[PDB]
From Swiss-Prot, chain B:
Residues of the full protein shown: 305 to 544 of 595
Effect of L212A: Abolishes interaction with NCOA1, NCOA2 and NCOA3
Binding site for 17beta-estradiol: E45, R86, H202
Organism field: Homo sapiens (Human)
The encoding gene: ESR1
Annotated ranges, domain NR LBD: 7-217
Disease listed for this protein: Estrogen resistance: A disorder characterized by partial or complete resistance to estrogens, in the presence of elevated estrogen serum levels. Clinical features include absence of the pubertal growth spurt, delayed bone maturation, unfused epiphyses, reduced bone mineral density, osteoporosis, continued growth into adulthood and very tall adult stature. Glucose intolerance, hyperinsulinemia and lipid abnormalities may also be present.
Top-rank taxon, per record: Eukaryota
Name of this protein: Estrogen receptor
Top-level taxonomy: Eukaryota, Metazoa, Chordata, Craniata, Vertebrata
């Protein structure tokens, strides 16, 4: 994994992308039926996210305890960044699934969600204005998984992280940006990870306030 | 502006000169009440934080409403990064003030703090094993201010990015090492944002600014 070239790192991440799932086909929504649809969608996406995580270069080198801890810390950030990527070409709307395209006005169905919704819409628009590319997106998504959670494991994680930084830079140079523009865009992209982490923390708090484990799914699949 | 015309060295020099002082916890030897000391220290530090923010290049160009909003979102993040900077050379301890240096054991007195306490220590040791430099620290603190929560904001952030790269180049880092270190520092920013969100949560569970921000700004 540390032996990969930038081009191999990009290609591995693109081939590892999870599928776009559909919402259940179950009518103005109520708080219970909207959260029921989103929970059921999140639960099904989580299985594919575990398969994706196992293919992120360096992830399966970790102990099985750390693989679980990283997924436990990152899963909502990863769901959210997938959501904001999918929503880029739908201004004013969040594409939870191709059959579950919601505007902020539907977010009010759930008490405490419309504000986290607005952050997601704002982040989506920022990705649009930055012209975020899919190859950059898979790098950021990978960074989120490795960064969100043995001193040797930490060290190993950092080397993969450095490799992904090199890959991001390599992509920007290969696209013809100047070195100044390369370092600037790299910063702009990483600073958005701060916003995604914040939205995840607000989301986790919102979810804890509602009646509802991931731990069992992680362990079953990770060991599998 | 003049802020957008600054060189990397002027940006560093301005930020170094705007650094607030390290305040001390009040001395009441016969006075748990650990939170009282931390709140009083935090309140006095905020006053200097507002004065510092006004000297971050490009900050006073914003409207008063945005200046207020950035400080309201960033203040605990700024407090925390100052804390981890001060604690770098005290492994296992958080130097809230020179006379209030606590270890984990002392942190466990406050219910709800020990989780965030361990995260603060981990960030400090990480800053310690990257040998974070004081000029890098002031740039990171500025980024936190501007990134907290406009095109002008984006341009100053580009300038601080350029300044950070300049510092690493002048320190002899290779270009590959320059972009790697730049990524490492900014990724630590998301942990600081994380620690701040948990801290607001912890603080909100204990009963105990907008008007102070408006008065000073
Ligand atoms: C059971 C317990 C529980 O939540 N805790 C904390 C113990 C519920 N199972 C956890 C997963 O539940 C969900 C339900 C709904 C979503 O929606 C969702 C996003 C989101 C969540 C919360 C707020 O306030 C705003 C947005 S983002 C996103 C992206 C995606 O691809 C699919 C769903 C989704 C997540 C998890
Ligand atoms: C009223 C309401 C309210 O908002 N709160 C938060 C009580 C008054 N607000 C005044 C701000 O209050 C404080 C009190 C104590 C600290 O301690 C502190 C840090 C910290 C706090 C909580 C957790 O869970 C972890 C760490 S970090 C840090 C750094 C520093 O230089 C000075 C104090 C300090 C902060 C704000």
């Amino acid at each position: 994994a540390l032996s990969l070239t930038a081009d191999q790192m990009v290609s591995a991440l693109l081939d590892a992308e999870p599928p776009i799932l559909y919402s259940e086909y179950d009518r103005p929504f109520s708080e219970a039926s909207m959260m029921g649809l989103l929970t059921n969608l999140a639960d099904r996406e989580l299985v594919h996210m575990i398969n994706w995580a196992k293919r992120v270069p360096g992830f399966v080198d970790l102990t099985l305890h750390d693989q679980v801890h990283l997924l436990e810390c990152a899963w909502l950030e990863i769901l959210m960044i997938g959501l904001v990527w999918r929503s880029m070409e739908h201004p004013g709307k969040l594409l939870f699934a191709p059959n579950l395209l919601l505007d902020r006005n539907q977010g009010k169905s759930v008490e405490g969600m419309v504000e986290i919704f607005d952050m997601l819409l704002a982040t989506s628009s920022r990705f649009r204005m930055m012209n975020l590319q899919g190859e950059e997106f898979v790098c950021l998504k990978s960074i989120i998984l490795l960064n969100s959670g043995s001193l040797e494991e930490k060290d190993h994680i950092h080397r993969v992280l450095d490799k992904i930084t090199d890959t991001l830079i390599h992509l920007m140079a290969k696209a013809g940006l100047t070195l100044q523009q390369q370092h600037q865009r790299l910063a702009q992209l990483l600073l958005i990870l701060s916003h995604i982490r914040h939205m995840s923390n607000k989301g986790m708090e919102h979810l804890y306030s509602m009646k509802c484990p991931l731990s069992d799914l992680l362990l079953e699949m990770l060991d599998a």
